[PDB]
């Protein structure tokens, strides 16, 4: 839907690794890059 | 690699009305220091 909403941080890690791919878990959901 | 473990670190006294230097977690200055009644948000801090 449209309108303007901004996304408020919720946590950070400060974890070593690295990553490259990603995998998940009416069931739709929009990936954008 | 972040760090992960580090030693533990002191803390003062807290004054006002006074040009005191000041280190508010890593933050440096020099000014007078006083209440205030600006609103932030929950995660915002500077």
């Known amino acids: 839907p449209q309108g303007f909403s901004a996304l408020e941080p919720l946590v950070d890690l400060p974890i070593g690794i690295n990553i490259t791919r990603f995998q998940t878990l009416a069931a739709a959901y929009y990936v954008g890059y | ?46």
């Open chain 2, 1 to 46: 690699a972040p760090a992960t473990v580090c030693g533990p670190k002191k803390s003062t006294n807290l004054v006002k009305n006074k040009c005191v230097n000041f280190n508010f977690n890593g933050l440096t200055g020099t000014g007078v220091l006083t209440e205030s009644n600006k609103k932030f948000l929950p995660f915002q801090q500077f």
